[PDB]
Design a protein around this nucleic acid. Structure first.
Lengths: 146, 117, 63, 155
RNA sequence: AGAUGGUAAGGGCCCACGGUGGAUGCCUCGGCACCCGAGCCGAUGAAGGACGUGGCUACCUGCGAUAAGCCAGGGGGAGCC
RNA sequence: AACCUGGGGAACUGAAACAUCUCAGUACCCAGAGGAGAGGAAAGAGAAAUCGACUCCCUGAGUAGCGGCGAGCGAAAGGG
RNA sequence: GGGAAGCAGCGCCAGAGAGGGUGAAAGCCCCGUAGGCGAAAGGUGGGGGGAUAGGUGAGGGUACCCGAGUACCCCGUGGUUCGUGGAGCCAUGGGGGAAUCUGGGCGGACCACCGCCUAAGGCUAAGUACUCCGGGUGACCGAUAGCGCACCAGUACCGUGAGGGAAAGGUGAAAAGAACCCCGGGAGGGGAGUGAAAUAGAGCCUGAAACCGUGGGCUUACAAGCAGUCACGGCCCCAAGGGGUUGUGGCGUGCCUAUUGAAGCAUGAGCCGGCGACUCACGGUCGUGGGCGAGCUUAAGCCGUUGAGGCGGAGGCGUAGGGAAACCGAGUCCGAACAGGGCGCGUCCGCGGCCGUGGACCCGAAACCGGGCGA
RNA sequence: UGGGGCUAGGAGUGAAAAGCUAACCGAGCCCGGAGAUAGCUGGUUCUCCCCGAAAUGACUUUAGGGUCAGCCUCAGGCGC
RNA sequence: UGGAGCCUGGGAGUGAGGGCGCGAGCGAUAACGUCCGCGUCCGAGCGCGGGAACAACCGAGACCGCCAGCUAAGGCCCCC
RNA sequence: GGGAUGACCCCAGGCGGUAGGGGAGCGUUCCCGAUGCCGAUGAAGGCCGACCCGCGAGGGCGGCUGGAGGUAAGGGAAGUG
């Protein structure tokens, strides 16, 4: 192919918007024409009036942490058996991170939705619902951390 | 890359000054006094083409009246006559007949007072 | 460079799956003395409109 | 910027009843001496393009060329021992008179040494194939080792 | 009884040729940025200076009362002061 | 010339007033080191039947927390 | 052709067609480039070799030693994300004041369990920081730019002093820089002569605008105006059409800003030239051109290139939501409740609009604080 | 009255005016913090095409400044 | 079937109004005065015609060109 | 509406405009295109025109001046009017 018309197709539009002229965006620069449009304005998102935000609403979302910090406890990642539907043989955590799901987010909890499938599934937890559906052939390798 | 002014400014400037030849004093020298002058000159022209169409309306009518008043009647009357007489013609422009071939103007006046008396 | 989350919003308003902004009805931390059981009973959470688009913008990174 | 400028900070004149206009110091950008407003500063223009999109192109590049009928991959380099004369001759036997430009890709140092100085040759090892070079030339010539490491660069 | 022509002290518009002035373009022993390399000196008197130094010498440069330079080793080959 | 460690150490400003708070251990002053300086071989980290001097980069993370719970400030472990 | 390096005929080298120079535009004319060489002397130098100094076991018994105004407690403060807080740890001005491994400190008040570490003496390359100095590069500047300075600049010049701080580059390929004559005290000119060119003749390339002259055409001394425009008519210059000028007639309240409203007797501007104001980084959010898709994507670094690209999954977003939380999960929370009710069906790069943090469109105060300089 | 000395910036000196402290002192000059901040005043540069506002309400140490609503615009969807 | 309408989202400016008519308050059945309410025009149509001159009274919503024709308010003795 | 979609022919409407929103273009500097193309039989820049093409910003053409540089089609950055 030639060097003419590698031309970026259809929409590149590098045309930024310059306001120095008598056509388009004049004197004032396409916006402005007053005062406090001049080097800064207070926010908004959160600010202003000088009034009372809407920091008038309270934090009943209480229980918010004391000095030495958060507590390190075990955390559980879910995965609907509908997703297990693909791959076959024996499913084990870590074999799940080596794939779209789980990754390091620690203890596996299989649960939930979609038709089950006949195979052994190693986990730390299942929901009520999920464990039953695995009755039509399957596994309860559970507990672990041992 | 810097992109200094370069040649550009001069060229927008004398584009205009050519447009300004022969206005009085600083209005053909200064590349901004000239601009201000040219603005009004523009508007003046637009307004005045409009006006031309009117300035000759007056002329044609002023001398038709002179001419047909020379046969007895007046302009008001003469035009009404032609209207009824069915001659969608004259076209005030083309009543220069009053000056060239008054023989034939005379004829038209008869037709006119025909429908009028 | 790089935004900081508005700690006093995080501390008081959770944000839903749809993107709505949800918090606790104002007006009951010493109002009481005698108001209807109806009044103080009626404190679960709620929507806010237009003004949550602002709230949200401040919980940038965490979502 | 008006701070990187040499001058002192003093207030050039009073501000008030002087008759002149109001001014700061002379490092200000309305000052011909001055600092410069939104001027360039040293900066990095590079960005991480999707590695996938790099592969596609490299491949799409060689294809077009082969479609033209302009790709030719070879083996027999009789024009060897790093001498322009030799290659010159070999190239005419292959049908390369210097009427089109050539991306000559090979792992062979000595064949690379031989060309180079021809204006109609851009020489290059197999590791550094890249779509720019491919396109800016008219005809492409590969060693077989070179065509190998090109297949491994895809899949 | 009558009539539109006719003068330029000076002035205005246009055209031509000069004067002043130093824009434009082209030019670059200079600058700016990044990357590499290299990194202390001084009582055995530093860094920084003053005065002095040529047949003739204002300044710059180099030298220090042995003062545009003294000794030796290495490099180079026809011109130097 | 900067660059480094120690001893001292502001205010304008921000908080749409201001006093705690912020700018900031910044600007600046002083002493000392060197081609670098500082640090450095566990009276350590912190929850792992764990790691294994010190410095430096990427993550961790605007997270855990601190805060007239305001304006705002902001870690460490762990992994590369 | 003033001059060849252009154009034309016929050749040659290339591990060298980077670049610069020569009277214009040259691989092969000059200096270079690829490639390859070289130190008597001084610096540097485990990178590679050698030599010392120094250091390497096990049991069983005594219980002699293991860093003092110290640990430790109390009072007053600092460091840390920690602003008195449930306030630990690390440091310490004041008061009291130990023990030597059955010794002592730590794991966020404290007690008990279970563990981690040995305070009160010291040294220790490398990975990292910076750029006065030397070299290489540039979708960096090109004399109002770029350093304050391309030029004899921290100079002239200003200030008692600390300190402030400019302007100012260019004949020609070659000086061949105009002998000699003529007017003039000179300075200038006029001939002559050099040169391709001398309105290239020396603060000399090109030489734009304001501004000042001379010459020529049209035009004006009974008029009156934001200075122009429309229409006729006369004169002057190449031809049934144009250009220049303007006698008479028609019509007409400067530009900008600011404003309810300006020709306004409201702001700014003597005129010309050159300088002069919406940016960049990192987050964010819509939109959009692509890649791949239930997945998409790499950071620092490592290997190549010397204008080549590869590798590198720590990490990040997404695949499930509710709840302060314990937690449960296609549900979950308030509730005694198989009442009701609330929430609950993509990513990477490019491009463009807007937001946050940084002066963040550009010029401007009165002042505040620090270190110095002045009787 | 000549010559030689001493005292300084919240400091000196003052037969007392807030006088004097290097030609403007109700707190000197120089450099730095620094491009302080400035809800205020001024300025903002090529061309054509289509649409085209507001000067109201609520709260505001608010009143010539703001935040939400209202009125302008573009894109997608819906269709009397 | 309209530069109508409704829904979701990206970008604004405006938050100083003024005159006229009609309906009230304040004022003195004063003010180019001042407060609200309904409408209009200027603002942004100081573009054009009428009104001697003149943002908002009457006529009328200006893509360009023509030495053609009909009208509107207002006019037809001369200036015209 | 034709519909051989031809971006060309036919018909019918809209086109005053400040703050603003949206759409198209023109020009300045630099990079790829380039070991190329133009160039002393004259580059850039400068001075004139009543001529040609564009709605316009602009772009061609011709004449004089100038004496060594300039750089298409199609794209990319910004100290861009």
């Amino acid at each position: 192919d030639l060097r003419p018309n590698p031309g970026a197709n259809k929409r590149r539009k590098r045309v930024g918007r310059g306001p120095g002229s008598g056509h388009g965006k004049t004197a004032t620069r396409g916006h402005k024409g007053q005062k406090s449009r001049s080097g800064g304005l207070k926010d908004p998102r959160r600010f202003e009036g000088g009034r009372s935000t809407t920091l008038m609403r309270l934090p009943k979302r209480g229980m918010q942490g004391q000095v030495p910090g958060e507590i390190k406890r075990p955390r559980y990642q879910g995965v609907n058996l509908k997703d297990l539907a693909r791959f076959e043989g024996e499913v084990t955590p870590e074999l799940l991170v080596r794939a779209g799901l789980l990754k390091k987010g620690y203890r596996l909890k299989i649960l939930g939705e979609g038709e089950a499938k006949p195979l052994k599934v190693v986990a730390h937890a299942f929901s009520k619902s999920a464990l039953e559906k695995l009755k039509a052939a399957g596994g309860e390798p559970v507990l672990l951390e041992a | 890359p810097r992109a200094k002014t370069g040649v550009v400014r001069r060229r927008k400037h004398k584009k205009i000054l050519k447009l300004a030849k022969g206005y009085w004093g600083l209005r053909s020298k200064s590349a901004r006094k000239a601009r201000e002058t040219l603005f009004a000159a523009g508007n003046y022209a637009y307004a005045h083409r409009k006006r031309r169409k009117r300035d000759f309306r007056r002329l044609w009518i002023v001398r038709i009246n002179a001419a047909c008043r020379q046969h007895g009647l007046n302009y008001s009357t003469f035009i009404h006559g032609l209207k009824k007489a069915g001659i969608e013609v004259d076209r005030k422009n083309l009543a220069d007949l009053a000056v060239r071939e008054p023989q034939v103007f005379a004829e038209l006046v008869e037709r006119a007072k025909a429908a009028q008396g | 460079p790089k935004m900081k989350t508005h700690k006093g919003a995080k501390k008081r308003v959770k944000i839903t799956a749809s993107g709505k902004v949800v918090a606790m009805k104002t007006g009951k931390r010493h109002l009481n003395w005698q108001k209807s059981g109806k009044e103080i009973r009626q404190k679960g959470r709620k929507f806010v409109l237009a003004k949550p688009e602002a709230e949200r913008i401040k919980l940038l990174l965490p979502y | 910027t008006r701070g990187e400028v040499a001058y002192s900070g003093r207030k050039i004149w009073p501000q008030k009843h002087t008759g002149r206009a109001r001014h700061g110091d002379i490092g200000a950008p309305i000052f011909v001496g001055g600092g410069v407003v939104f001027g360039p500063k040293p900066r990095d223009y590079s960005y991480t393009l999707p590695k996938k999109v790099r592969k596609k192109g490299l491949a799409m590049a060689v294809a077009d060329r082969a479609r033209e009928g302009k790709l030719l991959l070879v083996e027999a380099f009789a024009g060897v021992n790093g001498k322009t004369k030799e290659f010159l001759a070999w190239a005419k036997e292959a049908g390369l008179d210097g009427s089109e430009s050539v991306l000559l890709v090979t792992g062979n140092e000595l064949v690379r040494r031989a060309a180079r100085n021809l204006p109609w040759v851009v020489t290059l090892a197999p590791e550094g194939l890249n779509v720019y070079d491919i396109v800016r030339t008219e005809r492409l010539v590969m060693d077989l080792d070179a065509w190998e490491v090109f297949q491994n660069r895809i899949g």
